[PDB]
Design a protein around this ligand. Structure first.
Ligand SMILES: O=S(=O)(O)OC[C@H]1O[C@@](COS(=O)(=O)O)(O[C@H]2O[C@H](COS(=O)(=O)O)[C@@H](OS(=O)(=O)O)[C@H](OS(=O)(=O)O)[C@H]2OS(=O)(=O)O)[C@@H](OS(=O)(=O)O)[C@@H]1OS(=O)(=O)O
Ligand SMILES: O=S(=O)(O)OC[C@H]1O[C@@](COS(=O)(=O)O)(O[C@H]2O[C@H](COS(=O)(=O)O)[C@@H](OS(=O)(=O)O)[C@H](OS(=O)(=O)O)[C@H]2OS(=O)(=O)O)[C@@H](OS(=O)(=O)O)[C@@H]1OS(=O)(=O)O
Ligand SMILES: [Mg+2]
Ligand SMILES: [Mg+2]
Lengths: 517, 103
């Protein structure tokens, strides 16, 4: 009461191989469902079939949504990191929330007054054992303000279990966090905790110099031969002969390679222009999707892929990449004018193009009587001899994810890009102390529903330590860097419009530094 | 099936004194792989056959063919042989996603 909790510590630092940063901001915490649980299943769906089936509840508590970058780093520093280091990973993390302030609110005749009620308190905790359904990683909105000065509110919390559409199987668990320890905290009382990561391969934040098809010297040839002559073009009697050749400095396509492009999944090629697209609603039909327990659904935000080939800016995977609406986007049918679609013209070195075919294989077995068939191959699996690179980062997006604690997993690198962990940073959940309004003078068997509408605020602290690998390359020529366009514009990039409301001009990736393959 | 071999499946090594193009089978030494026919299938051959849709009392039971495939748990194999008249080792691409980087 007569003392503050903690100063405002929010900056960045570059000690070299490490880079510590934190973000101090403020929030607000409103009551929910009037401190009451709920059962939210497809009974509240109103339309969908065994496709959008969901069976869960709504806890009166709330959680934190800071799993992004543009909310942890500033624009410039991001630039700083990107244009300088090849790879990075998170090392340490901390959390502090303090300077809490509870304010009850009376509503006498539409004339409401907001007073302060320090007598109240709050309860919050962390799920270390990961017994609660990990929610983040789903990249729900309502993240920490990608901006510092602006404050926000913490989103309520709700989860889902196994369900048979409008109903649920017995194997549908049920949870209630109020069955856990919670740092009961009153105003004046601060709160902090500590977390640490584990080893994870640094997100390869770099672009390659060569390609799989072109990693071999040109001046030489391959002492190895190949079938370059099925028939004999010795006239009109092109019989069945067997001519062979070697690594032609010109026939480098027919040459010999030792590696192979990563796995793939065929997507539907759409375009940024309108007239280039057919005239049929295939958004949910001609789309690439999978099937699960009848509950058929999309197979993205992604796959492990690259958007398109050279000079195909117009076309992009239908559901292959990410989509980020500029500041001020509604919930539906907004136009391309608002969003910032993610171009993947960067991985066209290792990963194929989803909108594109993948390969072509033998259909049966050619012979002197029956013709030689050549089948096409759009979809594929993985095999030894395949190498690729997962999705990029896009600070205007997720930062890390949650690995499903199961037995069978493979290269658990996220499909929304980022980092995966078998033991990820916990989930932070909070609620306002249930202040029972005026109780009946005489006894009653039932429970209390009456309360006092109240909420609180405070400062969110998060120290994220970081690891990095800087470019040590001898690339003689000036590689490419990322920089705000050096010309004169009306509203500076990442600047605050004359109304304080600022946005991001464009999305940003990492694969910039030309790292030799 | 000595006569048949993968079109581009194996290696080719011309005996001493081979030009750069269209030389004949008389010169090279094609690599026979009649050794791994224990674990690894035959590329020139189909791989498997799977269900096409869902048979029923009215509609016939379909059986689709499977030439190309991916990998799954429960699969075991052995990479290519050595062939001293060939490469000895290789270079792994310094990337993030790689699997059984056997050449
Ligand atoms: O054993 S395989 O089926 O894999 O094929 C190689 C040999 O099979 C043939 C004939 O079959 S046999 O009874 O096993 O000797 O298969 C090819 O032709 C058969 C019927 O043809 S034939 O005119 O009697 O020779 C067809 O089908 S089936 O046997 O699988 O039922 C196939 O063709 S088709 O595309 O359906 O028209 C074809 O085999 S396959 O489907 O490609 O596997 C002979 O094929 S051949 O080389 O094309 O002539 C092979 O035996 S052969 O007598 O040495 O040719
Ligand atoms: O739900 S599934 O499509 O996967 O299939 C099982 C049931 O679907 C049917 C009929 O559809 S329904 O509207 O969902 O009830 O699908 C099968 O027949 C439909 C149309 O047939 S029908 O004569 O009205 O029964 C066809 O297509 S479609 O529904 O997917 O558009 C399918 O056949 S076809 O090969 O295109 O000719 C067929 O389904 S599927 O393609 O194999 O998935 C019924 O199928 S049935 O068992 O073969 O009769 C199933 O419902 S049922 O009434 O219990 O039979
Ligand atoms: Mg056959
Ligand atoms: Mg069907």
């Amino acid at each position: 009461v007569g003392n503050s909790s903690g100063n405002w510590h929010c900056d960045s630092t570059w000690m070299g191989d490490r880079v510590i940063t934190t973000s101090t901001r403020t929030w607000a915490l409103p009551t929910y469902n009037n401190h009451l649980y709920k059962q939210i299943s497809n009974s509240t769906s109103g339309g969908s079939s065994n496709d959008n089936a969901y069976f869960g509840y709504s806890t009166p508590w709330g959680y934190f949504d800071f799993n992004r970058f543009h909310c942890h780093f500033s624009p410039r520093d991001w630039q700083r990191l990107i244009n300088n280091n090849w790879g990075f990973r998170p090392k340490r993390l901390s959390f502090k929330l303090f300077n809490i302030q509870v304010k009850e609110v009376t509503q006498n005749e539409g004339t409401k007054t907001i007073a302060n009620n320090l007598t109240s308190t709050i309860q919050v905790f962390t799920d270390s054992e990961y017994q609660l359904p990990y929610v983040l990683g789903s990249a729900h909105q309502g993240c920490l303000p990608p901006f510092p000065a602006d404050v926000f509110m913490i989103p309520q919390y709700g989860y889902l279990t196994l369900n048979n559409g409008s109903q649920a199987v017995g194997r549908s668990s049920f949870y209630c966090l109020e069955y856990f320890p919670s740092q009961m905290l009153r105003t004046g009382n601060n709160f902090q905790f500590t977390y640490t990561f584990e080893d994870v391969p640094f997100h390869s934040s770099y672009a390659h110099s060569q390609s799989l098809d072109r990693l071999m010297n040109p001046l030489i040839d391959q002492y190895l031969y190949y079938l370059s002559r099925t028939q004999t073009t010795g006239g009109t009697t092109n019989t069945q002969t067997l001519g062979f050749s070697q690594g032609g400095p010109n026939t480098m396509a027919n040459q010999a390679k030792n590696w192979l492009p990563g796995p793939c999944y065929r997507q539907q090629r759409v375009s940024k222009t309108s007239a280039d697209n057919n005239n049929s609603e295939y958004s949910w039909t001609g789309a690439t999707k999978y099937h699960l327990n009848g509950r058929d659904s999309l197979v993205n935000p992604g796959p492990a892929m690259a958007s398109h080939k050279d000079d195909e800016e117009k076309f992009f995977p239908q559901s292959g990449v990410l989509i980020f609406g500029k500041q001020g986007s509604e919930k539906t049918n907004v136009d391309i004018e608002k969003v910032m679609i993610t171009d993947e013209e960067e991985i066209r070195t290792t990963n194929p193009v989803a909108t594109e075919q993948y390969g072509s294989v033998s259909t049966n077995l050619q012979r002197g009587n029956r013709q030689a068939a050549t089948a096409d191959v759009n979809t594929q699996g993985v095999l030894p001899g395949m190498v690729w690179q997962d999705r990029d980062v896009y600070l205007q997006g997720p930062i890390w994810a949650k690995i499903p604690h199961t037995d069978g997993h493979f290269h658990p690198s996220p499909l929304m890009g980022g980092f995966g962990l078998k033991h990820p940073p916990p989930q932070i959940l909070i609620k306002n102390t249930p202040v029972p309004a005026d109780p009946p003078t005489t006894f009653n068997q039932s429970k209390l529903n009456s309360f006092i509408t109240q909420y609180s605020t405070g400062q969110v602290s998060v120290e994220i330590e970081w690891e990095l690998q800087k470019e040590n390359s001898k690339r003689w020529n000036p590689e490419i860097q990322y920089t705000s366009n050096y010309y004169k514009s009306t509203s500076v990039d990442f600047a605050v419009n004359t109304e304080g409301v600022y946005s991001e001009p464009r999305p940003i990736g990492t694969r910039y530094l030309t790292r030799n393959l």
